[PDB]
Amino acid sequence: TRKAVIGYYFIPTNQINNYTETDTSVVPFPVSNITPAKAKQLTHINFSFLDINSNLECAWDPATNDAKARDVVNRLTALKAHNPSLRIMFSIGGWYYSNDLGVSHANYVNAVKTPASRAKFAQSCVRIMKDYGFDGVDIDWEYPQAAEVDGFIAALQEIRTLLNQQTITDGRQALPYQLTIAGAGGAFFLSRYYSKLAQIVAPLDYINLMTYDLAGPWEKVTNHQAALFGDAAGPTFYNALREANLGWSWEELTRAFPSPFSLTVDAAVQQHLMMEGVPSAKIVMGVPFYGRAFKGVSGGNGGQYSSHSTPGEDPYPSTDYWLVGCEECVRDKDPRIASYRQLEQMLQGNYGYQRLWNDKTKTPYLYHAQNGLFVTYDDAESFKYKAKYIKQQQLGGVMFWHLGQDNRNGDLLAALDRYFNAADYDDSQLDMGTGLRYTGVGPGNLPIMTAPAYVPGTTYAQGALVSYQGYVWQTKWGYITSAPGSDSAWLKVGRVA
Amino acid sequence: TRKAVIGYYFIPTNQINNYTETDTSVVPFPVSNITPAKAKQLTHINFSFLDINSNLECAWDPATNDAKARDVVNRLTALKAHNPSLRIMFSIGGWYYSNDLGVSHANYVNAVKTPASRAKFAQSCVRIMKDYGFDGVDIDWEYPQAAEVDGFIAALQEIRTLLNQQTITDGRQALPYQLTIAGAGGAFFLSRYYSKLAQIVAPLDYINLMTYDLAGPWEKVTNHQAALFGDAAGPTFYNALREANLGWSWEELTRAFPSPFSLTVDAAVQQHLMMEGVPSAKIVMGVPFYGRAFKGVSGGNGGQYSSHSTPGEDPYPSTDYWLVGCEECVRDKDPRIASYRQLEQMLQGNYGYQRLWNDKTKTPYLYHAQNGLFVTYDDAESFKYKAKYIKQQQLGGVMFWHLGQDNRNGDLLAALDRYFNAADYDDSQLDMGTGLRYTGVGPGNLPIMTAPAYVPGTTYAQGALVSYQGYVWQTKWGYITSAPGSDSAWLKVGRV
Ligand SMILES: CC(=O)N[C@H]1[C@H](O[C@H]2[C@@H](O)[C@@H](NC(C)=O)[C@H](O[C@H]3[C@H](O)[C@H]4N=C(N(C)C)O[C@H]4[C@@H]3CO)O[C@@H]2CO)O[C@H](CO)[C@@H](O)[C@H]1O
Numbered sequence: 001t002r003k004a005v006i007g008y009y010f011i012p013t014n015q016i017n018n019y020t021e022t023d024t025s026v027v028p029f030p031v032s033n034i035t036p037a038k039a040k041q042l043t044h045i046n047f048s049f050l051d052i053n054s055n056l057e058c059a060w061d062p063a064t065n066d067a068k069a070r071d072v073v074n075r076l077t078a079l080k081a082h083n084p085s086l087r088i089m090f091s092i093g094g095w096y097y098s099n100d101l102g103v104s105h106a107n108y109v110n111a112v113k114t115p116a117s118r119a120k121f122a123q124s125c126v127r128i129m130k131d132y133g134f135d136g137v138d139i140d141w142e143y144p145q146a147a148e149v150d151g152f153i154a155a156l157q158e159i160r161t162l163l164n165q166q167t168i169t170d171g172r173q174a175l176p177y178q179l180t181i182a183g184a185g186g187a188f189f190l191s192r193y194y195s196k197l198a199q200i201v202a203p204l205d206y207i208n209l210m211t212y213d214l215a216g217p218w219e220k221v222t223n224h225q226a227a228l229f230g231d232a233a234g235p236t237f238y239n240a241l242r243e244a245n246l247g248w249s250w251e252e253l254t255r256a257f258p259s260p261f262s263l264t265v266d267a268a269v270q271q272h273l274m275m276e277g278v279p280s281a282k283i284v285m286g287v288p289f290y291g292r293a294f295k296g297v298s299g300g301n302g303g304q305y306s307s308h309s310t311p312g313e314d315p316y317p318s319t320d321y322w323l324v325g326c327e328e329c330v331r332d333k334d335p336r337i338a339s340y341r342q343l344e345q346m347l348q349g350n351y352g353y354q355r356l357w358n359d360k361t362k363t364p365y366l367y368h369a370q371n372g373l374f375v376t377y378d379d380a381e382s383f384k385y386k387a388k389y390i391k392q393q394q395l396g397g398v399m400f401w402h403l404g405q406d407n408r409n410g411d412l413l414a415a416l417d418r419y420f421n422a423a424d425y426d427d428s429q430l431d432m433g434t435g436l437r438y439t440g441v442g443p444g445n446l447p448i449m450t451a452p453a454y455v456p457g458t459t460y461a462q463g464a465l466v467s468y469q470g471y472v473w474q475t476k477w478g479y480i481t482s483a484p485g486s487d488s489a490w491l492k493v494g495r496v497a
Numbered sequence: 498t499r500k501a502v503i504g505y506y507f508i509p510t511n512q513i514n515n516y517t518e519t520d521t522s523v524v525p526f527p528v529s530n531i532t533p534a535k536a537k538q539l540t541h542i543n544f545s546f547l548d549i550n551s552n553l554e555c556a557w558d559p560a561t562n563d564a565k566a567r568d569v570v571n572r573l574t575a576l577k578a579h580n581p582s583l584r585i586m587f588s589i590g591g592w593y594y595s596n597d598l599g600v601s602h603a604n605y606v607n608a609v610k611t612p613a614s615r616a617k618f619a620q621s622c623v624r625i626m627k628d629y630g631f632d633g634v635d636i637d638w639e640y641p642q643a644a645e646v647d648g649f650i651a652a653l654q655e656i657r658t659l660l661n662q663q664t665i666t667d668g669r670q671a672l673p674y675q676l677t678i679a680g681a682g683g684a685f686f687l688s689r690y691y692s693k694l695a696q697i698v699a700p701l702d703y704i705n706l707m708t709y710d711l712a713g714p715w716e717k718v719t720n721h722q723a724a725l726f727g728d729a730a731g732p733t734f735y736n737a738l739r740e741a742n743l744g745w746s747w748e749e750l751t752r753a754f755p756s757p758f759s760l761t762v763d764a765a766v767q768q769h770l771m772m773e774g775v776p777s778a779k780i781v782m783g784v785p786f787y788g789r790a791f792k793g794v795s796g797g798n799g800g801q802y803s804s805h806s807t808p809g810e811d812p813y814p815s816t817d818y819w820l821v822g823c824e825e826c827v828r829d830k831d832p833r834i835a836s837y838r839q840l841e842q843m844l845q846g847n848y849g850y851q852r853l854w855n856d857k858t859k860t861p862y863l864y865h866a867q868n869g870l871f872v873t874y875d876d877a878e879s880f881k882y883k884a885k886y887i888k889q890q891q892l893g894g895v896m897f898w899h900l901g902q903d904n905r906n907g908d909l910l911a912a913l914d915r916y917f918n919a920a921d922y923d924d925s926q927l928d929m930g931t932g933l934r935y936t937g938v939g940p941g942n943l944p945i946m947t948a949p950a951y952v953p954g955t956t957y958a959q960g961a962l963v964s965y966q967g968y969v970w971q972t973k974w975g976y977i978t979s980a981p982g983s984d985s986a987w988l989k990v991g992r993v
């Protein structure tokens with residue numbers, strides 16, 4: 001089956017209001033950049049972002065000029081003409097609107113509270129979808145927590161049943177309306193709703209993992225923001241998943257979530273597959289079309305894993321724009337982040353950056369020896385290893401943030417589409433490296449094991465293995481005369497074939 | 498409030514059926530051994546053991562001479578004329594009857610299975626009590642598994658209900674009928690029901706921790722069977738509590754249950770105090786009035802922490818009675834155990850035993866260099882530390898197994914009584930030592946702390962402390978944006 005290539009397209013309210021396709025200083029990446037050929041390279045385009053208002057309904061930023069809004073959305077849906085399988089989704093949320101301290105957080109929390117609120121909210125979603133010509137709904141709430149999860153789940157199920165009904169009504173069987181969500185790509189944020197992944201992913205066509213921003217100025221050590229696999233030399237973190245209300249024993253939590261561990265894309269992907277009820281075909285690996293910059297980095301190792309003098313606040317607190325050659329940073333007032341387009345132009349501008357590569361993480365990075373600068377980003381090369389990882393692990397596909405950050409030619413998007421569909425591209429021999437793989441094993445992804453059936457009245461020595469009621473259990477100590485199961489003496493280690 | 502001195506009194510069916518107070522060769526320790534003075538040193542005497550028959554009711558061993566039984570119990574209850582606080586309880590269970598593989602194990606599992614079965618069993622308990630003149634019921638099921646816990650609890654609740662009624666009906670406000678159980682004194686067995694300790698203890702006056710047998714020939718290395726505190730040189734064990742059906746986070750589990758750890762009396766007490774709703778006042782520390790012997794030990798550390806060649810199976814697998822000087826071992830046909838009374842005689846018989854003392858575990862032990870023997874046991878000296886510990890931890894009192902193993906002078910009983918009630922005894926200067934203390938912290942033994950009230954809307958760095966809902970919490974990582982109890986990044990680390 002074809003792999004999904006979901007490209008979020010972010011366009012600020014301000015830009016929508018002053019929309020033009022002839023003034024790169026106003027709209028840096030207009031829709032006019034996506035040609036029929038480029039449209040053919042995508043399966044989904046996720047317009048970002050819509051939000052939830054105080055009325056507990058899906059809506060545009062009130063400051064948005066509606067007519068200009070519909071116009072931007074029209075240029076996008078027009079692309080469907082050049083791709084019968086292309087879907088134009090709209091995403092609700094985004095870090096700014098939905099984070100705990102986001103301006104609209106209460107709206108997300110409140111909308112999902114009751115059957116009534118969920119019905120009204122879900123209905124507003126379908127209205128908006130049909131009103132502007134979208135093909136599905138994507139929720140990017142970062143992120144539901146504690147008591148919020150069940151509501152969130154009920155909301156997703158509700159939206160689902162409505163979409164499915166709309167599909168029938170609109171006779172859209174050939175291109176069903178879809179529901180997706182952008183999920184956390186790191187254990188910390190993932191720990192919030194992890195225990196209920198299955199229920200959450202159940203009504204979805206895809207869960208888009210935000211496997212990036214796994215490094216940044218808000219961390220004390222420089223590192224790759226999207227390492228595919230781990231580098232022992234890089235930092236590690238406490239595995240927040242073992243703080244999730246799972247009901248697993250100490251042993252289970254320990255074997256499921258090793259810690260410390262390398263925060264990588266592989267880890268996020270594996271942590272999702274660990275859970276029972278989470279199909280890999282629904283998992284979509286996210287990749288960044290932007291890089292994150294650090295300053296005050298010590299030399300000796302390309303700027304990797306170094307202490308740094310980079311502010312972690314938001315917004316950027318100074319007026320000092322130290323990312324050499326990043327004019328985009330000056331315009332946007334943040335030297336800590338830059339689009340691939342800008343980064344590429346920087347490597348083009350002979351500014352002193354060296355383009356380095358980590359063979360463990362399988363990602364590139366820039367080192368400015370002179371100014372002590374470090375940039376972590378992804379490119380067509382790192383995407384090769386990730387595209388193959390997607391095939392190998394049989395994931396639903398690839399997602400990226402975001403379309404407007406690709407170079408004018410759209411090399412990043414073309415690469416992705418190429419690695420999955422091009423007849424003349426061949427990665428059968430691409431070596432995935434020796435980077436550290438996430439090997440947590442939880443009661444959900446238990447391996448098939450073989451052991452004599454348990455025998456009542458028998459006393460077992462420590463480390464003894466037996467099969468009982470569909471599983472292979474092992475004793476954590478000796479003289480155990482209890483049966484495998486509820487009692488704490490036995491550890492479920494495998495599944496009975 | 499007076500510390501409880503609970504002495505179990507075990508008399509085998511054979512000894513009851515041949516009861517005599519004038520022949521130590523038949524009944525080694527008849528009731529007449531408990532003189533008025535000794536009766537005053539006790540608060541409870543738990544008659545052991547009664548069982549649960551196939552009719553799923555409490556009942557005396559089938560082969561028991563009822564008439565002889567009642568005479569023995571009457572002698573015991575007669576003892577009350579010398580101590581108006583004394584209670585003669587009877588204990589149902591014991592290892593032989595109720596262990597997973599014991600003769601009556603099925604009866605314990607079934608007796609508590611249904612409301613009807615529990616109702617019937619509960620009533621049989623009170624009936625036996627009122628019928629033989631006992632003062633309370635002690636359940637010694639070693640031990641109910643995780644699925645039988647809720648029924649065990651319901652059964653205790655049912656028994657508590659009937660006893661409180663009987664107390665009124667019999668006008669026993671002054672000396673209310675009681676309900677206790679012999680609880681595990683080690684994590685492994687404790688882990689079976691640990692998670693529901695609170696519910697188990699609720700209906701009880703006391704939970705008698707069998708904080709002994711923490712070592713034996715069934716373990717690869719010789720060790721102190723009842724060390725008060727841990728000795729780094731000694732063996733450590735897997736902390737089974739971290740595998741209990743607690744539903745706690747890794748962080749919570751790891752701080753409550755360090756592993757490996759030292760299998761000690763302190764460890765057991767702390768493990769109980771760690772749970773919420775488990776009052777120290779109801780915790781009673783068990784002490785043994787018997788020692789455990791090993792053979793084929795090597796020297797270098799007085800026979801401690803040495804490999805040995807002692808068989809572990811019950812019954813003793815041979816007729817080789819190697820405990821030198823232990824005639825009791827010949828009679829009972831097991832050289833791996835000796836009453837304190839027997840040990841004392843072995844020590845005074847100059848058979849080549851040396852009484853050494855571990856100042857970390859605060860316990861005595863015998864080492865026979867010639868034959869390579871090792872004996873772990875307790876005495877009046879180790880009882881000083883445990884008695885102080887009982888006081889310092891504000892525990893309910895002490896319990897021991899069993900009266901019949903003390904010496905004719907009732908020295909161990911006397912020691913316990915003295916350490917708690919003698920006006921001329923003073924242990925304020927007694928040094929508890931540097932032996933390893935159990936350091937686990939749980940929901941029920943959280944430290945008192947002070948921290949700034951959590952402030953909605955604030956972002957907290959890793960390691961921050963805030964007060965919320967009467968507790969102090971700490972963040973497990975950084976950029977914590979939500980409140981304690983709603984965001985799993987918060988760990989409850991203190992109270993008040
Ligand atoms: C404040 C506001 O609403 N708009 C800002 C705008 O904010 C953007 C940027 O900060 C984005 N960062 C980057 C590197 O693009 C940020 O992107 C987040 C997004 O919210 C999350 N959602 C996803 N999905 C895959 C759905 O991924 C993440 C990405 C980061 O990877 O989004 C916010 C808006 O929430 O920033 C611009 C200039 O930076 C500013 O002019 C203004 O328009």
Ligand SMILES: CC(=O)N[C@H]1[C@H](O[C@H]2[C@@H](O)[C@@H](NC(C)=O)[C@H](O[C@H]3[C@H](O)[C@H]4N=C(N(C)C)O[C@H]4[C@@H]3CO)O[C@@H]2CO)O[C@H](CO)[C@@H](O)[C@H]1O
Nearest residue numbers: 505509588591592593594637679707710787829831834898
């Ligand atoms: C096997 C039997 O029924 N009768 C045996 C008798 O068995 C005793 C002994 O093995 C006791 N052991 C010791 C060291 O005294 C054993 O005591 C156990 C008891 O079951 C548990 N209950 C408690 N409580 C505090 C309630 O503590 C433990 C103690 C060990 O600390 O009990 C069994 C019976 O269950 O052994 C004698 C002598 O070998 C034999 O003649 C015969 O009467």
